[PDB]
């Protein structure tokens, strides 16, 4: 009458919580990776016409 011998209802809750927390971590790091600097404000160019 048990669920399983190896896929018990206590391992599955730990894996559901681990999967949720990994999903949040992967989405957050995908936001982190798309982060740029706008290098044009940090330097200067001559342009002797102006």
């Amino acid at each position: 009458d048990i669920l399983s011998s190896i896929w018990t209802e206590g391992l599955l809750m730990c894996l559901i919580v681990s999967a949720l927390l990994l999903f949040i971590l992967i989405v957050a790091l995908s936001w982190i990776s798309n982060l740029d600097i706008t290098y044009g404000a940090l330097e200067k160019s001559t342009n002797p016409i102006k």
Partner: peptide, 22 residues
Amino acid sequence: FTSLGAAYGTAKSGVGICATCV
């Protein structure tokens, strides 16, 4: 999770700080 948000806030703001103050 809170330090991972503080890092985004700090980096994304400090870049605009270093670009402004030139």
